[PDB]
């Protein structure tokens, strides 16, 4: 399913620090340059180990086998009502 | 932005995209809405079946020829017959086999073809022209971009003739609708979803977003309004007000929604 | 009279079995997987599958402070 | 995309006509 | 379907595809012009490959 709410992480700095505005501008720059994206793909997806089919199914024919056996059952029924 | 810098307005509330260049001159509140540059095209027509699609795999010539062949076999039998029935059997065998196969190829061709997935595919093909607004955050994004795909796309867009750029959103969308799917419009995800939820509903968004950014409320640098507005945006975000508002304007009253 | 009936019917069933045969190959296998829970709304409505969050943090506080129906129920 | 080829099948049509020709031949030598 | 599997083409049709998949490992010589080409290269695909 989807996400319950939409929010985000962030770099935290003490109120009134000289580092705050530089840090923010840095994050913006990294965001627009795609640094954050490439980093995410690096750690999450790129090395991701989890990652059409020509193969046989016994299951698809099973239903028709059921209608076959049912048909033969009806056949036995008719054979009985006749005799 | 100009009104904010030169003090003609105390605050700016609008789908204003947060960019570094704008963050240098003004102050942005925490984003109240999330978006991204996305691709809008014309959705393909579902079906136009006719009865002609059944006569498609086998040629009209083959139908006429098999009819005359049929009547020829009948008039031959009218005048030994074992090789006739045999040859006819082989004939209709080859034909029904051929029909079955060609029809199979039709059915492959139908579902197999994928028109567009991601922006990279747009960059790799010249068949479908594509463009953005005459101005705004998206165009500037493509322009300043050093990223391979976006660089290529920008080069094409600027160099392409006639101009692929449009003045307004409605113009771009109208261009998407009129072009029979030969034109793609690059616009922020929000607007795309909104237009996608509005009649005639002939347009759709394909693939993910090219980038991830957000809108925000802007206030003059050193304004007293900045921190209260920000804490307010946070309050609304946590309270779910923003979510309910988007559902209100975008989805809930959606005609095709 | 019945000969052309047999003929037309044979042609009909011929075209149909041919079409079915052709489409089945293309259809192949969907390999689709069933999902017990489609969305968060469904989760609130069933007691069969228990669910939880961390002992503390933003998620727990979200559920605690939530005035939204579904999330409220889930929290309770 | 449909070749719907009349040419490939044309040959089988030819062997059909040939078979019916031989058939007419046999029908003639019979009577 | 099986005979279309035989008819299936392009396991790897380009250098880019190697960059796009982690299943098949790939490499160059311990030294020489190729490795240095990949090291010094600033163009996207080959860069990724070098990384
Ligand atoms: C709709 C317009 C013209 C605005 C809205 N956001 C972008 C902005 O903040 O400039 C512009 C669109 C864009 O560039 O994708
Ligand atoms: C992993 C932990 C304990 C942290 C990380 N982010 C959330 C936070 O910032 O509160 C917490 C998880 C959570 O609340 O479910
Ligand atoms: C065969 C070797 C080691 C030499 C030949 N040319 C390259 C060179 O001129 O260094 C080297 C191969 C390579 O770098 O792939």
Curated annotation (Swiss-Prot), chain D:
It is found in: Cell membrane; Postsynaptic cell membrane; Postsynaptic density membrane. Detected in forebrain. Detected in dendrites of neuronal cells. Expressed in the pyramidal cell layers of CA1 and CA3 and in the granule cell layer of the dentate gyrus. Ionotropic glutamate receptor that functions as a ligand-gated cation channel, gated by L-glutamate and glutamatergic agonists such as alpha-amino-3-hydroxy-5-methyl-4-isoxazolepropionic acid (AMPA), quisqualic acid, and kainic acid. L-glutamate acts as an excitatory neurotransmitter at many synapses in the central nervous system and plays an important role in fast excitatory synaptic transmission. It comes from Rattus norvegicus. Belongs to the glutamate-gated ion channel (TC 1.A.10.1) family. GRIA2 subfamily. Palmitoylated. Depalmitoylated upon L-glutamate stimulation. Ubiquitinated by RNF167, leading to its degradation. It comes from the Eukaryota. The lineage of its organism: Eukaryota, Metazoa, Chordata, Craniata, Vertebrata. The postsynaptic actions of L-glutamate are mediated by a variety of receptors that are named according to their selective agonists. This receptor binds AMPA (quisqualate) > L-glutamate > kainate. Induction: Down-regulated in the pyramidal cell layer of CA1 in the hippocampus by global ischemia. The chain holds residues 805 to 835 of 883 of the full protein. This is Glutamate receptor 2. The M4 transmembrane segment mediates tetramerization and is required for cell surface expression. The chain crosses the membrane at residues 9-29. Homotetramer or heterotetramer of pore-forming glutamate receptor subunits. Tetramers may be formed by the dimerization of dimers. May interact with MPP4. Forms a ternary complex with GRIP1 and CSPG4. Interacts with ATAD1 in an ATP-dependent manner. ATAD1-catalyzed ATP hydrolysis disrupts binding to ATAD1 and to GRIP1 and leads to AMPAR complex disassembly. Interacts with GRIP2. Interacts with GRIP1. Interacts with NSF via its C-terminus. Interacts with CACNG2, PICK1 and GRIP2. Interacts with GRIA1 and SYNDIG1. Part of a complex containing GRIA2, NSF and NAPA and/or NAPB.
UniProtKB/Swiss-Prot annotation, chain E:
L-glutamate binds at residues 33-34. Palmitoylated. Depalmitoylated upon L-glutamate stimulation. Ubiquitinated by RNF167, leading to its degradation. The modification Phosphoserine is found at residue 41. Detected in forebrain. Detected in dendrites of neuronal cells. Expressed in the pyramidal cell layers of CA1 and CA3 and in the granule cell layer of the dentate gyrus. The record marks 12 as: Crucial to convey clamshell closure to channel opening. Induction: Down-regulated in the pyramidal cell layer of CA1 in the hippocampus by global ischemia. The record marks 39 as: Interaction with the cone snail toxin Con-ikot-ikot. It is found in: Cell membrane; Postsynaptic cell membrane; Postsynaptic density membrane. Ionotropic glutamate receptor that functions as a ligand-gated cation channel, gated by L-glutamate and glutamatergic agonists such as alpha-amino-3-hydroxy-5-methyl-4-isoxazolepropionic acid (AMPA), quisqualic acid, and kainic acid. L-glutamate acts as an excitatory neurotransmitter at many synapses in the central nervous system and plays an important role in fast excitatory synaptic transmission. Belongs to the glutamate-gated ion channel (TC 1.A.10.1) family. GRIA2 subfamily. The postsynaptic actions of L-glutamate are mediated by a variety of receptors that are named according to their selective agonists. This receptor binds AMPA (quisqualate) > L-glutamate > kainate. The M4 transmembrane segment mediates tetramerization and is required for cell surface expression. Homotetramer or heterotetramer of pore-forming glutamate receptor subunits. Tetramers may be formed by the dimerization of dimers. May interact with MPP4. Forms a ternary complex with GRIP1 and CSPG4. Interacts with ATAD1 in an ATP-dependent manner. ATAD1-catalyzed ATP hydrolysis disrupts binding to ATAD1 and to GRIP1 and leads to AMPAR complex disassembly. Interacts with GRIP2. Interacts with GRIP1. Interacts with NSF via its C-terminus. Interacts with CACNG2, PICK1 and GRIP2. Interacts with GRIA1 and SYNDIG1. Part of a complex containing GRIA2, NSF and NAPA and/or NAPB. This is Glutamate receptor 2.
